[PDB]
Structure formats: C-alpha cells, structure tokens
Structure 1
Amino acid sequence: QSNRELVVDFLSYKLSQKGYSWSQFTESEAVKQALREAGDEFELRYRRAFSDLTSQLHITPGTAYQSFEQVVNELFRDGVNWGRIVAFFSFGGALCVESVDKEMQVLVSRIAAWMATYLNDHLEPWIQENGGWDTFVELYG
C-alpha cells in the first residue's frame, strides 16, 4: 500500500475541505476513507489543544526538511502508534493549509502593489487628462 498516495489524497481532501483551489478542481479506497475520517475526528477533538502550537508555523521557500523532521520526531519520541500516525497526517494537512494561505496572500498582494504602482506613475496623469474613469464607463460601458 503506497504511502505517497495516502499523503496526496489526505492533502487534497484537506485543502478542498478548507475551500482551497487554484485551478477549477476498493481496499486502497477503504484506507483513504478511514484516514480522512480519522483525520477529521482528530481535528475535531484536538484542534483547540493543537492550535496553540500550529498557529505561527508556516513554511516558506527556505524552510528545510530537517526542521520539519526535527519537529515531527517529537510526536514519535515515545514510539509509533496509529493515533500518532493520524496526528502526523493532520499536522501535515494543517501545515499545508496554513502555508498555502499565507503564501497566496503575499503573492497576490505583491502583484496588486506592482499594478497600483504602475498605474500611479505611468497612467494616472493620462486618466485625469482624459476624463477620469467616468469617461471610460461612458465610452466602453
């Protein structure tokens, strides 16, 4: 049973569950379904208690795998069980959801700032000279 496949399924489920998209988007099924459901229950039961720690944690272009690995090792210090495996997937899903949110906001804000800068320096004088945006509406509404 492929672990990479689980990861990919769980992450898309969580992204989707939280309302994320950036595109218009049997035995193996049974594992996925139970993992999704266990991740859901774990989050309902523990998100408050997990929340104080999973607040600021947001991965950036530079974050190293080793940092991730050092942090995750804490969860498994007293050994591996299914509960802790589920916590791991949920932690991953929450990391992923949090990073995407921040990174996307930063990216779109930068481009918005670029456009506003260009408008102000190069285009606003013309707009004022040619009737403002009301003339645009009149002409092209």
Structure 2
Amino acid sequence: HAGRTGYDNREIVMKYIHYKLSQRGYEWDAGDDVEENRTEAPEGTESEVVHLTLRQAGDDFSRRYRRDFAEMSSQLHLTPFTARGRFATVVEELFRDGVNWGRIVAFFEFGGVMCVESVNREMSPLVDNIALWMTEYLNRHLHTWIQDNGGWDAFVELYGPSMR
C-alpha cells in the first residue's frame, strides 16, 4: 500500500532543477538515456498537480528572500572535491531541529542555486551530481517526515492553488 502515483525524490528534483536550468536555455543532459522510454506513458496528472505546486511554491519562497541563500553561496566556493562535502553542511543547518513544508522548500531551492553555480564557471554536468545528493538527503530525512505525515499530496492539499 502506497498511493498509485509513483512519487520519486529523484524525479521531483530532476523536474524542479530542469526548469531552473531551462530558464537560461542550458540543455541539461539529465536523461542521458534518450532511447524513448514510454513505459506507462508520460501522462501523470496525479503527481503533476504536486509538481506545479513544488516548482511554483519553491521559486515563490526564494523570491521572498533576497538575502539569505544566495548571500551564503559566496562561502560555498567552487570546487568538485569540497562541493559534495559543502552541500551537506548547508542542508544540515536547514533542518537542525525539525522538518517542515517551509524547510523542505528552502532546501529544494538551495540545491538549485548550487547546481547552477557549477554552470556559472564550467561544471554544468555537476548539476546531475547535485540532484543526486538532494534526493539522498531529501529522502533520508524528509521522505520520512513527509510520508509519515501524509505524503507528497499532503503538501499540495495544504497549498492547493486558487481553486485548482
């Protein structure tokens, strides 16, 4: 028993980060497996309603906070070795006491800022590694808080767009 959508932290971050990159027009090679994979068709109105909420809400939050996540980015510095180790330290502080919708969204936005940081210099591919770590930690901590407290749909119900 577990819904019938097929939610996946990996796919959620992939879609979110994708739009973040598309904004600039950088064809992110996320789906290296471009062999037309139409298993059960792309149609997924189920998890679709949640995607728009997370992607739209996430960006909405970051927009409300001009100086916080970006300002700190300067400390993150650029490097493929420390990048991985520096990422955890950032998400670790986000959820130090307890998790919440507002916190989840925050981390989500943070990951994108970092994934793009690499592209700023010359590490677009790094965007893939970022989404990977985000899915590990997200599910390592959030998935438990989200699933235990309803699930992905729980948030969409709370932040149900005007009518739709």
Match of 1:33 among 31, 38, 52: 52
CA distance in 1, matches of 2:21, 2:53: 17
Percent identity (aligned)? 63
Match of 2:26 among 20, 28, 36: 20
Which residue in 2 is equivalent to 1:81?
Answer: 100
Change (3 A) 1:36 1:62: same
Which residue in 1 is equivalent to 2:80?
Answer: 61
Which residue in 2 is equivalent to 1:97?
Answer: 116
Q: Does 1:7 align with 2:13?
A: yes
Find runs of 4+ consecutive structure 1 residues off by over 3 angstroms: 64-67
Q: Which structure shows the bigger proportion of residues in helix conformation?
A: 1
TM score, norm. by length of structure 2: 0.55
CA distance in 2, matches of 1:65, 1:49: 20
Which residue in 1 is equivalent to 2:71?
Answer: 52
* Structure 1 letter corresponding to 2:87: F
1:39·1:86 contact (CA, 8 Å) conserved in 2? yes
CA distance in 1, matches of 2:89, 2:54: 24
1:58·1:98 contact (CA, 8 Å) conserved in 2? no
Change (3 A) 1:14 1:95: same
CA distance in 1, matches of 2:55, 2:48: 11
* Structure 1 letter corresponding to 2:20: K
1:59·1:95 contact (CA, 8 Å) conserved in 2? no
Change (3 A) 1:53 1:64: closer
2:70·2:113 contact (CA, 8 Å) conserved in 1? no
